[PDB]
Amino acid sequence: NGPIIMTREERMKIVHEIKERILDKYGDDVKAIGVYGSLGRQTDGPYSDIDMMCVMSTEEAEFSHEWTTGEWKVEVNFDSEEILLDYASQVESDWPLTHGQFFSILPIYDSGGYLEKVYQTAKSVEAQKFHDAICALIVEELFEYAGKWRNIRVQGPTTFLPSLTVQVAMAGAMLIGLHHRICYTTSASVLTEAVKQSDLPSGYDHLCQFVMSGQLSDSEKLLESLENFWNGIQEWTERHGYIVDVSKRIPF
Amino acid sequence: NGPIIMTREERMKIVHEIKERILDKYGDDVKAIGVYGSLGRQTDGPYSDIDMMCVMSTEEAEFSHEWTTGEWKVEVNFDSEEILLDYASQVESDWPLTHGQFFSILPIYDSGGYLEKVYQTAKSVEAQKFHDAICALIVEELFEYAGKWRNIRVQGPTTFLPSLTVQVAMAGAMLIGLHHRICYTTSASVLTEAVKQSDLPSGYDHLCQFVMSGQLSDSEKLLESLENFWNGIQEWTERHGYIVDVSKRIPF
Ligand SMILES: NC[C@@H]1O[C@H](O[C@H]2[C@@H](O)[C@H](O[C@@H]3[C@@H](O)[C@H](N)C[C@H](N)[C@H]3O[C@H]3O[C@H](CN)[C@@H](OP(=O)(O)OC[C@H]4O[C@@H](n5cnc6c(N)ncnc65)[C@H](O)[C@@H]4O)[C@H](O)[C@H]3N)O[C@@H]2CO)[C@H](N)[C@@H](O)[C@@H]1O
Ligand SMILES: NC[C@@H]1O[C@H](O[C@H]2[C@@H](O)[C@H](O[C@@H]3[C@@H](O)[C@H](N)C[C@H](N)[C@H]3O[C@H]3O[C@H](CN)[C@@H](OP(=O)(O)OC[C@H]4O[C@@H](n5cnc6c(N)ncnc65)[C@H](O)[C@@H]4O)[C@H](O)[C@H]3N)O[C@@H]2CO)[C@H](N)[C@@H](O)[C@@H]1O
Ligand SMILES: [Mg+2]
Ligand SMILES: [Mg+2]
Ligand SMILES: [Mg+2]
Ligand SMILES: [Mg+2]
């Protein structure tokens, strides 16, 4: 019934059982096996799960095995070296949430320093990619969110405002992480680490304190905190040179 | 800045200006042009944006133009017929959130009934795809969320509980939408439409009204409501046959 409590040593025993199954099934096509997530960081809790990544020599390989035993859960990703390195150098809007997995890999099997290659690739991403992701985030996510809460103020529904506020605070956290080109430790610590960073957009800290405390019932204060954060954004982007093109009416 | 107030008539003027550029640039490679989102449903609000889809004849075409003028925002997706039809028949975990776009397309240009083809494809998916997506959702998301809030109870951080509770309520809404094979109208109405459907898992209704009202500060009331919803999941999946074999420790 649900995830049960497990200690670190029992989880690692499962990891090596899976590693032996992987090597028995795929043999010399396995280049490397590593553990990421909290278990790879050696900070797994009693109810933490298991996340493993495998580097294959197998040409264009990209698949995953994700299952439960009813008591615990495992996910194993299988990728070719080319596919994995390409993904590790691609900066999407949620890069600060996702790509921390490449910075604390616990090696389990490695025939040729592949896990070190993935780490070097992830930490050497060209600065321009973060600049482009920040500008895309403002247009694709933040500008759209602003239209949604401004609609809520004039026509509702207020029952969406708590969920929307959570999404906006998360998007702002991604914006800060992209600026500092720093990945957050884990999903549970995204907002906690975001508000402790420097160069915050004005109004972001105040907005986060609603989400972190759970006080999301005052719709008129939420709308005002969102509006203050939005105004802070375009300040913030012109100070750091993240300028968005608003000049073309049809840009194709 | 942000999105300004616009009327429906101003939005439709922009749509026909964009369609007119599309035909000039791509000519006979344009199979169809349609409007989706709230404008395609003719329920756009004062701050709503513009969402358009374009079916191309050029095989493997898949690109998008998404921009702002500082005052309003537009997104135009360009897809080949095969890529679009394939996507319209694939049932992911967020299918109830995304695939409503194929059920209320406002036609603007159609050289061969392609927009009707996309609609028929979207509504003619065999039930097995929804059964598999429901089972995948429980393993990949709900079981994982249960481990995360159980970690919060024993080790924190409690500041993540409001955001996690919102994610669980959304995942439950996807679960209900997949069961009934009905997509939600828009993101703002996901929770409102989810709790009005029949055959809900026990405890989901109570959990949603925490999220819909914004009262997410009582951490222990949230944790108990989450556990009740999780218990409701097990009876609900048991009763409807969304069962996966969980007996093997490594099922590959
Ligand atoms: N593998 C290389 C590369 O991966 C790409 O795919 C992405 C992404 O699409 C995929 O997400 C998976 C979903 O597609 C699938 N439906 C369910 C899986 N559970 C998803 O896995 C990822 O998301 C969960 C989130 N619960 C991660 O588990 P966890 O919370 O325990 O976190 C462990 C560590 O992983 C990082 N992290 C945290 N949150 C996320 C999210 N939301 N996405 C991705 N990574 C996250 C964080 O550092 C944390 O410490 C799970 O580990 C994670 N794998 O996952 C991969 C990227 O990993 C493409 N398939 C392709 O380009 C190529 O294969
Ligand atoms: N086009 C065929 C197919 O699309 C696939 O791509 C997906 C998905 O990856 C993509 O999401 C876009 C992001 O990748 C991009 N970074 C930013 C874009 N803004 C995203 O567009 C989609 O998400 C927004 C969410 N705000 C949608 O806008 P909106 O709130 O105005 O909603 C309009 C209508 O669209 C439906 N809807 C609602 N929420 C969503 C979300 N989260 N995703 C997708 N659709 C949503 C709903 O019915 C509502 O009435 C935006 O319209 C939407 N396009 O978008 C497409 C899926 O549409 C692949 N690229 C590929 O398989 C192929 O191209
Ligand atoms: Mg984990
Ligand atoms: Mg995991
Ligand atoms: Mg819209
Ligand atoms: Mg839109």
**What's the token pair of residue A119?**
């780490």
Cα separation, A105 vs B242, whole angstroms: 35
Candidates B1, B63, B185, B209, partner chain A, best to mutate (most A CBs within 10 A): B1
Cis, peptide link before residue A157, omega less than 30° from 0: yes
- The partner residues of A50 in beta bridges, in order of sequence, read A74
| Residues, CB-to-ion distance under 5 Å, ligand 6 | B 49, 51
> What SS3 class is residue A14?
helix
Of B143, B211, B219, the CB nearest to A3: B143
Residue with tokens 């074999």: B245
- Which helix (H) or strand (E) segment holds residue A143: the answer is helix A143-155
Q: Is A126 a catalytic residue?
A: no
Residue with tokens 């135009």: B76
Cα separation, A4 vs A9, whole angstroms: 15
Distance of CA B247 to the CA centre of its chain: 32
A 10 A CB-CB count for A136 gives 16
> What SS3 class is residue A242?
coil
The upper half-sphere exposure of residue A140, i.e. CA atoms within 13 Å in the direction of its Cβ, equals 15
**What's the token pair of residue B39?**
């404008």
Residue with tokens 């590790």: A88
- Ligand 1: which residue has its CA nearest to atom 16? B140
DSSP secondary structure string, A34-98? EEEHHHHTT---TT--EEEEEEE-STT-EEEEEEE-SS-EEEEEEEEHHHHHHHHT---TTHHHH
**What's the token pair of residue B158?**
């409690």
Would you list the domain boundaries of chain A?
1-124, 125-252
What contacts B206, CB < 8 A, 6 or more positions away? Answer: B225, B228, B229
Test B216 with A219 for CB contact under 8 angstroms. no
A 10 A CB-CB count for A64 gives 12
Chain A contact for B68 (CB, 8 A cutoff): yes
Is the minimum distance from the CB of A167 to ligand 2 under 6 angstroms? Answer: no
State the distance from the centre of ligand 1 to the C-alpha of A26, rounded, in angstroms. 23
Superfamily of domain A1-124: Beta Polymerase, domain 2 (3.30.460.10)
Of B18, B69, B191, the CB nearest to A159: B191
Contact B19, B33 (CB under 8 A): yes
Angle, CA of B45, B49 and B53, to the nearest 5°? 125
3-state SS, A146-177, equals: HHHHHHHHHHCCHHHHHHHHHHHHHHHHHHHH
DSSP 8-class letter at A195? T
Chain B contact for A198 (CB, 8 A cutoff): no
Cα separation, A249 vs A2, whole angstroms: 52
Angle, CA of A131, A104 and A21, to the nearest 5°? 125
Q: B229: buried, middle or exposed (CB in 10 Å: 19+, 13-18, 0-12)?
A: buried
What contacts B238, CB < 8 A, 6 or more positions away? Answer: none
Alpha carbon of A18 to those of A8, A49, A100, A189, B140: distances in Å? Answer: 15, 14, 23, 29, 18
Q: B245: buried, middle or exposed (CB in 10 Å: 19+, 13-18, 0-12)?
A: exposed
Contact A15, A107 (CB under 8 A): no
Contact B173, B194 (CB under 8 A): yes
State the distance from the centre of ligand 1 to the C-alpha of B109, rounded, in angstroms. 39
Q: What is the resolution of this structure in A?
A: 2.3
A 10 A CB-CB count for A143 gives 22
**What's the token pair of residue B129?**
């795809």
How many residues are there in chain B?
252
Contact B127, B168 (CB under 8 A): no
Q: Which of B38, B3, B35 is nearest to B19 (CA)?
A: B35
Test A192 with B157 for CB contact under 8 angstroms. yes
**What CATH number belongs to B125-252?**
1.20.120.330
3-state SS, chain B, equals: CCCCCCCHHHHHHHHHHHHHHHHHHHHHHEEEEEEEHHHHCCCCCCCCCEEEEEEECCCCCEEEEEEECCCCEEEEEEEEHHHHHHHHCCCCCCHHHHHHHHCCCEEEEECCCHHHHHHHHHHCCCHHHHHHHHHHHHHHHHHHHHHHHHHHHHHCCHHHHHHHHHHHHHHHHHHHHHHHCCCCCCHHHHHHHHCCCCCCCCCHHHHHHHHHHCECCCHHHHHHHHHHHHHHHHHHHHHHCCCCCCCCCCCC
Test B159 with A191 for CB contact under 8 angstroms. yes
Contact B44, B55 (CB under 8 A): no
Instruction: Kindly list the residues from chain B whose CB atom is less than 8 angstroms away from the CB atom of residue A3.
Output: 143, 146-147, 150
Furthest-apart CA atoms within chain B: distance in Å: 62
